[PDB]
Design a protein around this motif. Structure first.
Motif, PDB file in Angstrom:
ATOM      1  N   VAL A 122       0.861  -1.219   0.000  1.00 16.80           N
ATOM      2  CA  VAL A 122       0.000   0.000   0.000  1.00 16.80           C
ATOM      3  C   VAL A 122       0.884   1.252   0.000  1.00 16.80           C
ATOM      4  CG1 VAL A 122      -1.743   1.298   1.323  1.00 16.80           C
ATOM      5  CG2 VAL A 122      -1.942  -1.183   1.116  1.00 16.80           C
TER       6      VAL A 122
ATOM      7  N   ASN B 268     -11.734  -3.180  10.642  1.00 15.13           N
ATOM      8  CA  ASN B 268     -11.418  -2.852   9.257  1.00 15.13           C
ATOM      9  C   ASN B 268     -12.480  -1.969   8.611  1.00 15.13           C
ATOM     10  OD1 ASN B 268      -8.938  -4.555   7.886  1.00 15.13           O
ATOM     11  ND2 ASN B 268      -9.726  -5.498   9.765  1.00 15.13           N
TER      12      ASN B 268
ATOM     13  N   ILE C  45     -11.782   1.961   9.129  1.00 14.85           N
ATOM     14  CA  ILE C  45     -10.897   2.615   8.171  1.00 14.85           C
ATOM     15  C   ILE C  45     -11.458   2.529   6.756  1.00 14.85           C
ATOM     16  CG2 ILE C  45      -9.448   0.581   7.792  1.00 14.85           C
ATOM     17  CD1 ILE C  45      -7.065   2.774   7.927  1.00 14.85           C
TER      18      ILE C  45
ATOM     19  N   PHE D  23      -3.118  10.629   4.759  1.00 11.25           N
ATOM     20  CA  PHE D  23      -3.281   9.264   5.238  1.00 11.25           C
ATOM     21  C   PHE D  23      -1.967   8.493   5.294  1.00 11.25           C
ATOM     22  CE2 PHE D  23      -7.358   7.520   6.329  1.00 11.25           C
ATOM     23  CZ  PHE D  23      -7.103   6.190   6.585  1.00 11.25           C
TER      24      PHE D  23
ATOM     25  N   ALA E 240      -1.166   6.897   8.851  1.00 10.76           N
ATOM     26  CA  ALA E 240      -1.858   5.635   9.089  1.00 10.76           C
ATOM     27  C   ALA E 240      -1.152   4.480   8.393  1.00 10.76           C
ATOM     28  CB  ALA E 240      -3.310   5.734   8.627  1.00 10.76           C
ATOM     29  N   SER E 241      -0.691   4.699   7.159  1.00  9.50           N
ATOM     30  CA  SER E 241       0.002   3.645   6.425  1.00  9.50           C
ATOM     31  C   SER E 241       1.309   3.250   7.099  1.00  9.50           C
ATOM     32  CB  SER E 241       0.259   4.091   4.986  1.00  9.50           C
ATOM     33  OG  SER E 241      -0.955   4.245   4.273  1.00  9.50           O
TER      34      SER E 241
ATOM     35  N   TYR F  58       0.438   1.394  10.513  1.00  8.04           N
ATOM     36  CA  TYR F  58      -0.006   0.014  10.349  1.00  8.04           C
ATOM     37  C   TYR F  58       1.187  -0.926  10.240  1.00  8.04           C
ATOM     38  CZ  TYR F  58      -2.597  -4.018   8.607  1.00  8.04           C
ATOM     39  OH  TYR F  58      -3.139  -5.271   8.443  1.00  8.04           O
TER      40      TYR F  58
ATOM     41  N   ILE G 126      -5.400  -0.556  14.364  1.00  9.64           N
ATOM     42  CA  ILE G 126      -5.782  -1.614  13.381  1.00  9.64           C
ATOM     43  C   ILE G 126      -4.642  -2.630  13.269  1.00  9.64           C
ATOM     44  CG2 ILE G 126      -6.485  -2.101  11.002  1.00  9.64           C
ATOM     45  CD1 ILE G 126      -7.847   0.693  11.073  1.00  9.64           C
TER      46      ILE G 126
ATOM     47  N   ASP H  75      -5.379  -6.722  14.071  1.00  9.93           N
ATOM     48  CA  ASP H  75      -5.176  -7.764  13.065  1.00  9.93           C
ATOM     49  C   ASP H  75      -4.130  -8.778  13.519  1.00  9.93           C
ATOM     50  OD1 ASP H  75      -6.887  -6.049  11.710  1.00  9.93           O
ATOM     51  OD2 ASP H  75      -5.897  -6.382   9.780  1.00  9.93           O
TER      52      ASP H  75
ATOM     53  N   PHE I 196     -12.704  -9.651   6.302  1.00  8.79           N
ATOM     54  CA  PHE I 196     -12.024  -8.498   5.709  1.00  8.79           C
ATOM     55  C   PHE I 196     -12.803  -7.935   4.522  1.00  8.79           C
ATOM     56  CE2 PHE I 196      -8.246  -9.928   8.032  1.00  8.79           C
ATOM     57  CZ  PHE I 196      -7.738  -8.718   8.445  1.00  8.79           C
TER      58      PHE I 196
ATOM     59  N   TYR J 178     -14.358  -4.323   3.271  1.00  7.72           N
ATOM     60  CA  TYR J 178     -13.806  -3.742   2.052  1.00  7.72           C
ATOM     61  C   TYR J 178     -14.828  -3.580   0.930  1.00  7.72           C
ATOM     62  CZ  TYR J 178      -8.901  -3.690   3.461  1.00  7.72           C
ATOM     63  OH  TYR J 178      -7.705  -3.401   4.074  1.00  7.72           O
TER      64      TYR J 178
END
Ligand SMILES: [NH3+]C[C@H](O)c1ccc(O)c(O)c1
Length: 378
Positions: A136, A209, A212, A238, A241-242, A245, A299, A303, A333, A337
């Motif tokens: 990502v 999930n 987000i 963002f 956040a990436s 994670y 998150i 997970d 998930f 999504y």
């Protein structure tokens, strides 16, 4: 030397997410209802096809599905590179969803089957969940630079070459030559879905999930409406956040066993709820960095604490076959999504965006204490 299996699962997880984020900004420019269908087709198809792969892995084994996932992903990448129509885009996205489902389910099942130790299972799934985070983060800049300099088809051709290298490695080590059935039965999905603990874990994952999943598309519209920020502010908003994670996954995959998986999940749910509640109070980007960092870290905690707990529950209370339960996790998930963006937009149009964030935070906080039932009896 079972680290070759971990390397394959990590690379596979990195490449689908690299392709997932590269296509997102490119197609809409060249291409309400149809766009939403295109966005949600991959998740819907993956959610539909998870149980079939989960059942097939008990009949033929993991390597044949894993190899099939590379072949479908290579074909989808080539079609994305060369096709330029709407129907071909739908077909490519559906094939990508099928390949992603196969790769995720088969890889998680094989990782759970090989690393039978309870602590080592979490240790290796931490790195495995790390590959999704790396994809990502790395994908958007890669796609942007290759589209700007060389051409439209260059990123897809490079991704196809990388997928070919991954498939060559898979053929070298996995060697999917014959079909090998598993030893024992599979504990059918109807019995697994009646377990309250598996349901609690799946619900915690789904809600964490979905938070987000609804937050990511809704925030840019509010930022333009309230702060009138420029184009790059929406992109760099963002990033925390990436990064969080990745950091949280890689740390808590090892750190969750000592503190307790149930406690880690409870703390993660509380933290993500509080961060989502505090998000609407921000006035600029500097007010948005810390809440986004908190949401990503939480998150990552949830997970990395809720995958090995699913494996452990299946080992403890049923037969030691993991394909079905990890198909259940992938379904959890994909539930977030799939219907995330559309429902989030509908609610943010019916009521205010701060009301939507408040509702999400309250739901997460209220579901948080349910994780107390997951603690081990001793
Ligand atoms: N399952 C991964 C999780 O939903 C996720 C995905 C992308 C992100 O940028 C993130 O912070 C979390």
């Amino acid at each position: 030397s079972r680290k070759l299996i971990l390397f394959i699962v990590f690379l596979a997880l990195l490449l689908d997410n690299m392709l997932l984020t590269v296509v997102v900004p490119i197609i809409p420019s060249y291409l309400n209802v149809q766009v939403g269908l295109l966005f949600a087709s991959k998740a819907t198809v993956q959610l539909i096809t998870n149980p079939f792969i989960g059942l097939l892995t008990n009949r033929i084994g993991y390597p044949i599905p894993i190899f099939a996932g590379f072949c479908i992903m290579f074909v989808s990448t080539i079609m994305f590179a060369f096709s330029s129509s709407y129907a071909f885009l739908l077909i490519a996205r559906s094939l990508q969803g099928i390949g992603s489902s196969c790769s995720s389910v088969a890889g998680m099942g094989m990782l759970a089957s090989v690393y039978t130790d309870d602590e080592e299972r979490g240790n290796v799934m931490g790195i495995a969940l790390g590959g999704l985070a790396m994809g990502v983060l790395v994908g958007p800049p890669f796609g942007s630079v290759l589209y700007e300099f060389v051409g439209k088809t260059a990123p897809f051709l490079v991704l196809a070459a990388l997928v070919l290298l991954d498939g060559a490695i898979q053929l070298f080590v996995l060697q999917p030559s014959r079909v090998q059935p598993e030893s024992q039965k599979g504990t059918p999905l109807t019995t697994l879905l009646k377990d309250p603990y598996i349901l609690i874990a799946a619900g915690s994952i789904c809600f964490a999930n979905m938070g987000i999943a609804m937050l990511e598309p809704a925030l840019p519209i509010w930022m333009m409406e309230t702060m009138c920020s420029r184009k790059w502010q929406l992109g760099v908003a963002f990033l925390p956040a990436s990064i969080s994670y990745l950091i949280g996954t890689n740390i808590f995959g090892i750190l969750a066993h000592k503190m307790g998986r149930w406690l880690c999940a409870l703390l993660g749910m509380i933290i993500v709820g509080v961060s989502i509640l505090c998000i609407p109070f921000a006035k600029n980007i500097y007010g948005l960095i810390a809440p986004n960092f908190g949401v990503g870290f939480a998150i990552g905690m949830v997970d990395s604490s809720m995958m090995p707990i699913m494996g452990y529950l299946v080992d403890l209370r049923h037969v030691s076959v993991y394909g079905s339960v990890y198909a259940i996790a992938d379904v959890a998930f994909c539930m977030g999504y799939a219907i995330g963006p559309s429902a989030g937009g509908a609610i943010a149009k019916a009521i205010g965006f701060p009301w939507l964030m408040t509702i999400i935070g309250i739901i997460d906080i209220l579901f948080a204490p349910l994780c107390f039932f997951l603690r081990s009896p001793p």
